[PDB]
Amino acid sequence: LELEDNVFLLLEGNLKRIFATPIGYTTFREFQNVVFNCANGQQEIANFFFEMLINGKLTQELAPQQKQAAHSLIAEFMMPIRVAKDIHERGEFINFITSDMLTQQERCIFLNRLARVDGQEFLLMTDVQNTCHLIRHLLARLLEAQKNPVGEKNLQEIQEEITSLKNHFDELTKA
Amino acid sequence: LELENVFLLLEGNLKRIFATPIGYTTFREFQNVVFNCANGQQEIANFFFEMLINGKLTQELAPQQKQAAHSLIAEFMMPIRVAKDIHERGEFINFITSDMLTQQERCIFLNRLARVDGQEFLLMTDVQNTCHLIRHLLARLLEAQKNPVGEKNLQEIQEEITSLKNHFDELTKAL
Amino acid sequence: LELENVFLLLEGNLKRIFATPIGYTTFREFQNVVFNCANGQQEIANFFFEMLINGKLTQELAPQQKQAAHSLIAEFMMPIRVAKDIHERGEFINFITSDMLTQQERCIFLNRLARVDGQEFLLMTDVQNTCHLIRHLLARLLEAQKNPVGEKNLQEIQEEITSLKNHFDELTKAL
Amino acid sequence: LELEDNVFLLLEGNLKRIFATPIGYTTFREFQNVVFNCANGQQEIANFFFEMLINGKLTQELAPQQKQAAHSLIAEFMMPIRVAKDIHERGEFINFITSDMLTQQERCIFLNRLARVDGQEFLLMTDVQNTCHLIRHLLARLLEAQKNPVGEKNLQEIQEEITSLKNHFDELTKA
Amino acid sequence: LELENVFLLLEGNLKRIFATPIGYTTFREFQNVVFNCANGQQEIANFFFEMLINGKLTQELAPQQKQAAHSLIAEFMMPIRVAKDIHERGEFINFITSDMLTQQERCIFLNRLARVDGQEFLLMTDVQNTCHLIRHLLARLLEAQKNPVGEKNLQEIQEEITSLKNHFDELTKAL
Amino acid sequence: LELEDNVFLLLEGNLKRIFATPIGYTTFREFQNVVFNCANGQQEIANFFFEMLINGKLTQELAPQQKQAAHSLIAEFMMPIRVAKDIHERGEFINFITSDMLTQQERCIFLNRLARVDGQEFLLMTDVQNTCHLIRHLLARLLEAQKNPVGEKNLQEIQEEITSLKNHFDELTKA
Structure with missing residues (x-):
């Protein structure tokens, strides 16, 4: 891979720009577009920056000044990029x-x-009554999830957390 | 009381303030409208408030005025009540x-x-988020129970709490 | 069917739920209102749903009840339909x-x-943003054309596509 | 210019504060107010910080510790300030x-x-039909821009991008 | 003019567009509805606009059509006027x-x-924020006074400015 | 206190995550939860990080690499945390x-x-008239604050700023 120092500098400015405003549902895609623009049709360069910025991993040796810049970009942008990806998903x-x-x-x-x-x-x-109705509604929903094969498996995964709820509730009723 | 085409002018003004979404200022904007239509007189304003808030005519009206009054009541009493509700809660x-x-x-x-x-x-x-939310809300019921006022509130909703019991039972047992 | 002043109680309740902006919960809140006014009875609820959603009275009513019913239909049928539309799309x-x-x-x-x-x-x-947006949307039409369902959708709007033709022609030629 | 180290420190804290919340339409002006407050009526100091933070340019030699702080402020704030200025404008x-x-x-x-x-x-x-109508609406708008002398010049600037749209569309129609 | 059940079809359409909150597109959506109900004919559209915007019937109508027209006017004239107001201000x-x-x-x-x-x-x-806001707004009145148009505006509200005088007097004196 | 380097690293990632999205009314509490999670039930560790990140103060000597990391965390997060706390409060x-x-x-x-x-x-x-009415409304509010013992003391604190308002206003009236 043959990158000029200018690429790290341009990439940093572009990332600073996109992360200057609130992260939203388009931000991960906007970031990908920045990387592709910088890679200029070179998949190996795009992948280098994606591994670096999404995974925090450097897939080739960089000269010391570029290695330092990569570490700075990772520190500044890796988490916000992961949050953008998370928002995109959930x-x-x-x-x-x-x-x-x-x-x-x-x-x-x-x-x-x-x-x-x-x-x-x-x-x-x-x-207090609203709170009780909200609890009943949410329990009713878990009970419906329990009828469904997927929901049942999800609930079995947190069986300990459920038994505990019942505990806390038994504690409320005695008093 | 002595009144002019006040009903039609009241109508046009109420139609205007209720043409946009009801907000937290709307009940007060309504009071201002009534005040202005009454030319500031408290006895006339009160006549309008009784009519428009409680649906009560505190005065016999000629057939034409009486028709307009019943129309204002049908059209605005509930939106006024909702505006007051919003102001309050x-x-x-x-x-x-x-x-x-x-x-x-x-x-x-x-x-x-x-x-x-x-x-x-x-x-x-x-499913896990739902469980956590329920745990959170349960904890609030426990918090209220430790406060003398909240404890009285809980005592008033015994039938509500028993409902949570049966739901909790069904869920834990079904797992 | 046997019914009480149910029409007036239905009216007050519908006026309340429609006094605020219609949202994604509004159609379901409406169904709950109908359920409650029917005292849970499915035959009575269905009578109200036919009346209020389709504007159809499935039963002769005394003059006074019949008057109230036509009023509910005029006042709420369209807002109900819009609430259902919003729920769906x-x-x-x-x-x-x-x-x-x-x-x-x-x-x-x-x-x-x-x-x-x-x-x-x-x-x-x-002007350039407008051009880019158009290019983007065109690309979506091309994407749909590659999907068997989308390709059928496109075939249904031939007259729409020809309209784009004439506009595209006028623009390119005028430059 | 005679600046105490304390000025860079105070300026940094104030900038960190204003950029802690989402950038909005008041943010560029809020930043100017921070600079003017720091300059304390001294136009030459205000201009020093504006050149530094808006343009990334240092208009006089700084001692090494202050030069380092200026570089840090530039790195942290120049892009967010330019984005604030951009938002203010467009x-x-x-x-x-x-x-x-x-x-x-x-x-x-x-x-x-x-x-x-x-x-x-x-x-x-x-x-797919909505998409087509949106395209037609946007094309109709470019056609109106084309009648106007300014719009015509704007369109001539991207004449190549327009001819391309027509291409993509001709590609959609054949299929 | 020659017209069909146009009033009922107009009614259903107006009920639909006014069932959601009025926005900045609503007046134009209304015009489109009128255009469509008129089958594009400008004379018929104008008849509807006079009726619906100004509450004026420019034509004698049979009893049934005339009844529907007065109903449309009562139900929609004010919401239409508010939609136009919003479009404008x-x-x-x-x-x-x-x-x-x-x-x-x-x-x-x-x-x-x-x-x-x-x-x-x-x-x-x-209290201090309130004072600062007042100072800000006062400064705007001073700004308007320096502009030839703003200075004319101020001259029109002498009774308003004197009111500010008496309030300012009461406050300063009471301290 | 015995902390592994891993704690500073984990804490940094968690803080980067919570500050990646807009600060809101839950953010200060979310930060406290991150600190408590990291402290793992150890109050002395929680307090160490709270003093560090809320107050910028290091309450024990750290080895050089950890001291550097603490300074970095302070620089990155102290102001945003203080802004979160401010938002929570006001x-x-x-x-x-x-x-x-x-x-x-x-x-x-x-x-x-x-x-x-x-x-x-x-x-x-x-x-210009709206501006005047807004000023009068805000002055009316200060006049009501002045009747109340607390409000009176608040106003006496800025007595100089008030007298000035009157000045600016006297300046507007002469012209």
Whole structure:
């Protein structure tokens, strides 16, 4: 492989540009387009940068200044690229939830925040009854998954986590 | 009370403010409209509020005015009530749907959460995510139980908690 | 069938769910409302569904009930149909507008894309962007043509494709 | 120019802060305000940092530790600043589009994603007929640009790209 | 003019386009609907536009058609006017609310800004933020005063400016 | 404290991941969860990383390679973490506003952009009268704050900034 220093520099500027705005569902494909543009029709060069930037792996010896630049690109871009790829694949999946209990009047309510893999969040208020209905709805859904052969195998994989839920619930009912 | 074609002018104004999505300012924009149509007079405004919020006519009206009044009530009472609801509790959960899908040996759920204000959020969960969400929400019920107000709330929904019992039983047993 | 003031209670409930923007949960929220007004009975629910979805009364009603029924049909049949449309195809394109502007020696277009669900997106393009978008979309038609199902779809719209012909002709010739 | 090391440090913290959240339409102006605040009414200091951070150019010799810090600031912030400036100028222009063909039933449809320079994206579904109508609409718009003297010159600039579109289309029609 | 059940077909179509939130394309979508119902004829379209935009019937109609026409006017004239307003000035401020709260020795305000298009934005300010915003806006009035057009605008609102005077007086004096 | 180099590496990857998407209201809590996971139930390790990453302070001597990694983590993540914490606390507060005056026809209007601490922005158009009404509304709000003991103390703190507003306004009225 014969690369000029200029390629690493141009590639860095282009990657800095695409990652300057929020990662979205087009970002992984936009990154691939940047690599292909840089490779200029040379599959071996494209693959070199994909291995480097997607896998953090250097598939040939580089001269010291280029090796340093590759390490810098890996450090700066590997995770954001993997997150772009993740969003492309499963950006709408739940990633995190927070809840803050507020006690007002007679009533205990929760300010819940739902965050997805793609970073979008949603605020949702629930009182204690809403919370119970939400739990029942989600349990009803696992019970339907359990009838299906795939769902059944998925549930058997976390059988310990399920038995625990029942524990926590038995703990709530006694009190 | 003494009133002019106030009903038609009230109508045109209510049609305008309700032609766009109802928001958190809409109930107050409505009050401002009523105030303006009453020329600021509190007795007349109150007559309109009773009519429009509670559907109650506090005064006999000539046939033509009475016809317009019943029309305003049919057309606006519920949207006004929803605007007040949103002002008060717009961020609370209102509805949830889930569609079960099977992708790559995984049972997954496309959930949609809708609030009182009509905003919705799409959230994907797999079986393990669903279990974690349930654990999270259960923990909130436990948190409420430790707070004197929340504990009273829980005591009011015994039939709700028993329902969670039977679902938890069915799931654990079926595995 | 035996029915109570069910029409008025149905009305108030439909007015409430349609007072906020229609979303992807709205058709299902409607079904739940009908179910609840029918006290769960499938024959009564079906009577309401025929009435409200298809505008068909499957039963003679006293004058007062019949009046309320025609009113529910006029007020809700189309919003119900749109809610079902959105549930099914809410993300599909519905309308596009373009306004041509001239800025700094450039012809530019302010495009607005609107979906079946009513969400809109503003997108600016210059002449070269517009050309690239067209090239992209053309490539999709070529992609569909390589798929046996897509190829059948294309064969159904011969008059559409000829229209593209005449536009392409006019443009190339005029340059 | 007489700068204390403290200025580079304070400037870095302030820039890190403003770039911690998504770039928006106010971000370039917010950056200018940070520079002016740091310059403290000294135009020569403001200009030094603007040349450095907007143009990547150092307009006077710096001592080695400050030169290193300037290079670090350039590497970290030059591209995001240029993107902020770009968004300020043309954030609503199209930047990228992806499409995924889905074959279901009899029908080939495309899940399109529209991304703007500002990073916002929009999902749009199209079937084969929608795609054709979109193409015709966009061609109609170029034809109107062609009547206008500016638009005509813009089109002559990409005359080769246009002739190519016609090619791709002639290729689609034969098949 | 010669017309068919055009009123009912017009009705169903208007009900459909107004069933979703009004957007920036809605007025144009309406015009397209009218065009299509008129079978493209400009005289018939104009009859519908007068009826639907201005509430004016430019033609005597049989009792049944006349009834349908008055119904279309009552149901759609205002939403059409709002759609045109939005097309023209959707981003302009329409309403603002503020609720004053006290948190941690601070007086704070929960402000909500609503535009002509119905979109809203929540914005918190403390006392100093509120002062800065006011200073900003005052500076804009000063900017307009330096522009010959803006200076004319200011001269038209003398009673508005005096109101700012009395408020400014009350505040400074009370401190 | 006995940490393996692997901990710094794992921690960096996890932080890079969470900061790859827009900071939101859950991000500070997500960061705490990452630290606790890394500490693996060891409060002293959690506190070491919290002091390091929240306060930029190293609470024990590290070997040179680990000290270098800690400095790198501080440089990369301290500000974004502080911004996450800020958003958690006051993300909805105003952060910045820009205005651009547009002169069209007889009329001077302003394209205002409102940016919050959380990075969300809102575009709002105002003409000269809207601007005056907005000022009056905000002054009315400060006048109400002045009646309240807390608000009064807040206002006394910026008494100089208030007197200045009055100045700028007196300057506008003379002209």
